Design a protein around this ligand. Structure first.
Ligand SMILES: [Mg+2]
Ligand SMILES: [Mg+2]
Lengths: 145, 143, 104, 171, 55, 75, 189, 121, 72
RNA sequence: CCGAUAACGAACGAGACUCUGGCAUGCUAACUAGUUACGCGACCCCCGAGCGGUCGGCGUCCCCCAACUUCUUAGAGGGACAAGUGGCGUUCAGCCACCCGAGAUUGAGCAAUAACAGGUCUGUGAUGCCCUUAGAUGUCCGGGGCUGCACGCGCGCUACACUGACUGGCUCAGCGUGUGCCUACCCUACGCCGGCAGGCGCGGGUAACCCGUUGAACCCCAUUCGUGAUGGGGAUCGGGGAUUGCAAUUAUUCCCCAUGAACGAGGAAUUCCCAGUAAGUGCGGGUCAUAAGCUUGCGUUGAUUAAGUCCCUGCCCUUUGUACACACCGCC
């Protein structure tokens, strides 16, 4: 605690396919991963039995791969069902947490599916408009002009 | 020198009560302590691990202060300020099940009993426990 | 019975309630029943605020309306019977009277 | 109790009942010199008192019309039968009743009298009944299509403060 | 139409369930204290009900 | 005035730098420690409480948002 | 005896210039244990003269929307900054405050309506009350925009603002602005 | 594939066990009582689908009601959803189940902004 | 009340109760030669501040402010 | 208002008035408010206090079975009048300072003549005239629309952060509402289930009896963070779960998990405001089957500046000038 910088302290890490700032706290470093938020980080760290008050760069490989393994399949790790992102999938109806660019391509394929079935929400997405029924008369002029 | 809980600062008093509750650990800690938020309006889980012991100690202190407080009562104490994002803020109450489970754990240690009316209060031996801890923390803060 | 009754008096004004609360208790003392002291409940104040305009065009003037409701509680308790003894009401229009019993 | 509403709604319903009764008697007793209505309420029964100039006119043949209106109010607000009584009270100093003088003027103008002479006569009568002041305004399509308003006023007439409430009557 | 569509459309709640107790209008009603009266009619009759002005 | 790149963890040239002259001047705050030692500031607080426990820095204020320290008296 | 904030006796503090000693209220007749009072000092003209300047600093410090009721936080700020300046200097914080008020009071200013020569048409010397008020306002402004977007907290900014104003070092916002005002006034003589 | 199950199982998937597969709003919708309008529309599609020629799509049926949720038993029908002016025919694909009928009959045509007039001087 | 107004009420009540106790159960000499220090130290310790609030009006959000007006 | 005075005598407005708030240990009363005392108790000290301390624990209008209104309530009353002092003043009207006083200017409501082609015929079984009146401009039902977006404007809210954000602990309100003639629709305690959004049973309250002692927010105390578009910021957008209804899609609303976009304090211009005021801060009512970024009020924290001016915008009186009189947005 408050020692010199550890010798195996990389300043940034490589998680899945993305890089995270090891200078910041682990509870907030992995929030850099898309699909990972502060609550998700908090719960995976608490059930990872990892001290929260240490930075990401001072971890070791076993700890970080435990974190990765929990994140990839948190169903078996007592993470409650309702806490997840991709619950009750539209393709296969299986409860899953999404962690990376799988989120990006899944969002993309959901939008193109909405367009293909020609949903009103999908058509709004196609035209770049608001889909939640907000007022477009006066607001959001920046995104077009 | 008779010492009541009203004569010592309640903050470190409830902290010492939580510490005693931790070290005299017999609690019915639910399995969902590590995950859930403490309220609708709270936006993070509590930072400390054994927050449950602290909250149960606070509920004990409140039932010492006044009796008959139901679950909705406790959430009324444990309410908080919902910032509600871009809309103006408001007031939001506490978690019903968290308070209920704390209470159930409180009669798990038989320091809390229900009233003849609705709600629950402290038992005389729980009052004794609180008073002993108050006297000992008074001795600690004085000496 | 042996009867212990409760009488409430309420209206919009204060003067009529005062004169009723005076003449009734005076009649009771003349008719030797001991009287529980006159209890004035907190005044109801119905506040209603409304735009003065019937159009909505103008300088946004809101008119406010008040209806002060005053109510008094006086109890008649006697060793003897009450209702067979006292029957006269002496009630002006505008004031409401309701007579209840201890069991009520 | 559960059947009986609270005090507030009770006073509100009383005010609504009074306003509806007054408005109905206005629309119905317009020509009979209607002046005002007074209701005296007891839990045993209620008493309705109507102030009008022509009591002999508001009462029908052997009290036919007063019976008619008693049945009307009986069936309208749904009183228990025989719990409401209709008393007609002949007003004193009809020149002071703003409502009655307004109705007499309106009757005169609908008759076709000259509005100038009708206003002068009504004002003279009101001041002859004895008053510390009077003021009448006629507004509408006088003369041509353009709207004009003629106000005839004499004597003292305050406008402001509390005392205008219990010194000046408005119709 | 017949009985099955002339008044079949539900109005057991909402603005269309209510009308002014005086002028039968559906705008500016005051449902406070069960008044059920239009705003303008409330202005017209507030003396008669007894709501007077103090402040 | 672009970026401060404050140090989150101590290194050798700054650890001894903290050790050898910090308890010498009158004012000791996390603010001054961070600003004259180019460290993050949570690190500053941690170092200050460690030096407190070691006992070579005297506490006066200990406020939740504004903690002030002084060196121990000379004499 | 009074010992504002539990220490820092008020008797020893001395007012150097007779120019503002009728408007500084640090003396035992105006010394108070704690700078908070519903003193109704705004009710009348010149009632702020009897108001202690510690209270004036506390009232003046809470500004800018986020701070319009946050008075006790300002009080704790004043107490902490007094702690800090006593530690950095060793003397009575109140004497530092008094000297800072003395040196931050701009002696003359310019104001008029017509065609500006440089900024205002005439140069006018000021009353002592305006000196005190403007000195306090300048000090609070200097602390506020000293601590805006930096890790150095508000207490230290207030502390070193008062220390620099107590001596005069051109490192404080207050006397920098005062010198600008004096230059403007002398040019617009 | 709606929730991992195939279409044919969805055909014989009765309401009560299907409400779990539906989202929250649709589950509330089936939990509340279906009215005679929905049942009449279902009967009309069933009659048309059975009288539909083999290897050939059925005839079109129109309807004002667009709050009808799509059932897997209507996949491949010709339904005419009113747009406020006309009834717009729409295919029922095997992925449209958790969708309203009105989500595919747009109520307005898109906006192509012409030159603004005297306003916004 | 709130917190600080509550504090002021308590301290005022302490001062007033002490001077009443000194006026009644002992001589007014002690009463007056504590009342003097109480007066020329803090008048509010014995006399309440009559100000409470001010009624909001229908032309502005607060007691004296008004909603922002624009001309164009 | 005093005064002069071809005026005299009046009248409205203003003032006056009503409410409101501020002091009343003075009166009246108080089990739908309590205070004090006592007795039961519970617990700490019991070394020893023991008339030690707490209790929002229970009783003493359960009728003989304690007193009292300080607190609370609301009525009668009182109280402030430029009343006293000093000064200025024609020594008249009156003005300033000071004492004593709760208060030496508490805010509102009401509010004159004459008008405006200002607004409302979409409030009316208020209405003239005109239009339509069975393929109805009446009226009903179904659906859409009133939200639709290259852009402009206004009132607002959120914010740009360390005077902060998060996590926990401690801790203080007042206004006012609450079950329906039609009219179905109340405010809610407590217990259980669920993590939250909710649901499941038992009650209370038609009300100073219940919600409720309205355990509000801000604030206060400790934790982490550390100057980064960062733990600020939460718009967009996905999945899922709840309530209202007949219906939630162009998402009603609420909730969980994801996304952290502009924004680093804002030009030319401009709004409001002098004390419990601005501002922060929450809370009630109105709209409500579902509901507030609005509004009406309420309370909490709580200032800087000023006791002056006509410079800007105007307002009022006298004199003056006019070629204006639809009245300088004139006329020419
Ligand atoms: Mg007036
Ligand atoms: Mg964060």
């Amino acid at each position: 605690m408050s020692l010199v910088i550890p010798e195996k302290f990389q300043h940034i890490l490589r998680v899945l396919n993305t890089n995270i700032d090891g200078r910041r706290k682990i509870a907030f470093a992995i929030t850099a991963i898309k699909g990972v938020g502060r609550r998700y980080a908090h719960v995976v760290l608490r059930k990872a039995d990892i001290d929260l008050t240490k930075r990401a760069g001072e971890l070791t490989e076993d700890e970080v791969e435990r974190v990765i393994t929990i994140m990839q399949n948190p169903r078996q790790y007592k993470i409650p069902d309702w806490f997840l992102n991709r619950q009750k999938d539209v393709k296969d109806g299986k409860y899953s947490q999404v962690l990376a660019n799988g989120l990006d391509n899944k969002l993309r394929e959901d939008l193109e599916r909405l367009k293909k079935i020609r949903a009103h929400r999908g058509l709004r997405h196609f035209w770049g408009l608001r889909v939640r029924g907000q007022h477009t008369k006066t607001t959001g002029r920046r995104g077009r002009t | 020198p008779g010492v009541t809980v009203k004569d010592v600062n309640q903050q470190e008093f409830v902290r010492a009560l939580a510490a005693f509750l931790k070290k005299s650990g017999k609690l019915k800690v639910p399995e969902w302590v590590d995950t859930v938020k403490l309220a609708k309006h709270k936006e993070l889980a509590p930072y400390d691990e054994n927050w449950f012991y602290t909250r149960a100690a606070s509920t004990a202190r409140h039932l010492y202060l006044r009796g008959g407080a139901g679950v909705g009562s406790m959430t009324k104490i444990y309410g908080g300020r919902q910032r509600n994002g871009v809309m103006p803020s408001h007031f939001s109450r506490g978690s019903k099940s968290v308070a209920r489970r704390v209470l159930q754990a409180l009669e798990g240690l038989k320091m809390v009993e229900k009233d003849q009316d609705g709600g629950r209060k402290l038992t005389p031996q729980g009052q004794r426990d609180l008073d002993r801890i108050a006297g000992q923390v008074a001795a600690a803060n004085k000496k | 019975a042996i009867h212990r009754i409760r009488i409430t008096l309420t209206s919009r004004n204060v003067k009529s309630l005062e004169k009723v609360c005076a003449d009734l208790i005076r009649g009771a003392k003349e008719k030797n029943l001991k009287v529980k002291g006159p209890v004035r409940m907190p005044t109801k104040t119905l506040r209603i605020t409304t735009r003065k305009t019937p159009c909505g065009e103008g300088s946004k003037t809101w008119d406010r309306f008040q209806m002060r409701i005053h109510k008094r509680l006086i109890d008649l308790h006697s060793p003897s019977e009450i209702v067979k003894q006292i029957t006269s009401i002496s009630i002006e229009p505008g004031v409401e009277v309701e007579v209840t019993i201890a069991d009520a | 109790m559960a059947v009986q509403i609270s005090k507030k709604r009770k006073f509100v319903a009383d005010g609504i009942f009074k306003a509806e009764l007054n408005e109905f008697l206005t629309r119905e007793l317009a020509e009979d010199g209607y002046s005002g209505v007074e209701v005296r309420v007891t839990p045993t029964r209620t008493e309705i008192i109507i102030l009008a100039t022509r009591t002999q006119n508001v009462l029908g043949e052997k009290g036919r019309r007063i019976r008619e209106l008693t049945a009307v109010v009986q069936k309208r607000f749904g009183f228990p039968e025989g719990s409401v009584e209709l008393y007609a009270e002949k007003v004193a100093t009809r020149g002071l009743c703003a409502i009655a003088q307004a109705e007499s003027l309106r009757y005169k103008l609908l008759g076709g009298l000259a509005v100038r002479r009708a206003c002068y006569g009504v004002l003279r009568f009101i001041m002859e009944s004895g008053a510390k002041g009077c003021e009448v305004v006629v507004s509408g399509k006088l003369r041509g299509q353009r709207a004009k308003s003629m106000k005839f006023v004499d004597g003292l007439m305050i406008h402001s403060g509390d005392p205008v409430n219990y010194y000046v009557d408005t119709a | 139409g017949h009985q099955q569509l002339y008044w079949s459309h539900p109005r057991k709640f909402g603005q269309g369930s209510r009308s002014c107790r005086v002028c039968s209008n559906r705008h500016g009603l005051i449902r406070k204290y069960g008044l059920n009266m239009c705003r303008q009619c409330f202005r017209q009759y507030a003396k008669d009900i007894g709501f007077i002005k103090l402040d | 005035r672009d970026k401060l790149n404050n140090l989150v963890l101590f290194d050798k040239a700054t650890y001894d730098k903290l050790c050898k002259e910090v308890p010498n001047y009158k004012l000791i705050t996390p603010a001054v420690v961070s600003e004259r030692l180019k460290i993050r500031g949570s690190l500053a607080r941690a170092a200050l409480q460690e030096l407190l426990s070691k006992g070579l820095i005297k506490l006066v204020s200990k406020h939740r948002a504004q903690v002030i320290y002084t060196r121990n008296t000379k004499g | 005896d009074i010992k504002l904030f539990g220490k820092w006796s008020t008797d020893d503090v001395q007012i150097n210039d007779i120019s503002l000693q009728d408007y500084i209220a640090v003396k035992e007749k105006y010394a108070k244990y704690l700078p908070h009072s519903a003193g109704r000092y705004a009710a009348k003209r010149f009632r702020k003269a009897q108001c202690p300047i510690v209270e004036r600093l506390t009232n003046s410090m809470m500004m800018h929307g986020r701070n319009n009721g946050k008075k006790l936080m300002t009080v704790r700020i004043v107490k902490h900054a007094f702690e800090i300046i006593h530690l950095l200097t060793g003397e009575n914080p109140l004497q530092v405050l008094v000297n800072a008020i003395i040196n931050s009071g701009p002696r003359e200013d310019s104001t008029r309506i017509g065609r500006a020569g440089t900024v205002r048409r005439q140069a006018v010397d000021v009353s002592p009350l305006r000196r005190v008020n403007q000195a306090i306002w300048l000090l609070c402004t200097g602390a506020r925009e000293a601590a805006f977007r930096n890790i150095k907290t508000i207490a230290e900014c207030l502390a070193d603002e008062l220390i620099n104003a107590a001596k005069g070092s051109s490192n404080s916002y207050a006397i920098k602005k005062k010198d600008e005002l004096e230059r403007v006034a002398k040019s617009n003589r | 594939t709606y929730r991992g199950v195939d279409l044919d199982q969805l055909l014989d998937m009765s309401y009560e066990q299907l409400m779990q597969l539906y989202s929250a709003r649709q589950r509330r919708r089936l939990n509340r009582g279906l009215r005679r309008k929905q049942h009449s529309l279902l009967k009309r599609l069933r009659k048309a689908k059975k009288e539909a020629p083999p290897m050939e799509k059925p005839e079109v049926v129109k309807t004002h009601l667009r709050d009808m949720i799509i059932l897997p038993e209507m996949v491949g029908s010709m339904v005419g959803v009113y747009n406020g002016k006309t009834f717009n025919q729409v295919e029922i694909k095997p992925e449209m189940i958790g969708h309203y009928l009105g989500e595919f009959s747009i109520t307005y045509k898109p906006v192509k902004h012409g030159r603004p007039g005297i306003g916004a001087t | 009340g709130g917190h600080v107004a509550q504090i002021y009420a308590i301290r005022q009540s302490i001062s007033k109760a002490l001077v009443a106790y000194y006026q009644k159960y002992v001589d007014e000499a002690s009463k007056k030669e504590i009342k003097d220090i109480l007066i020329q130290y803090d008048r509010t310790l014995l006399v309440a501040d009559p100000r409470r609030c001010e009624s909001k009006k229908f032309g502005g959000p607060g007691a004296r402010a008004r909603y922002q007006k624009s001309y164009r």
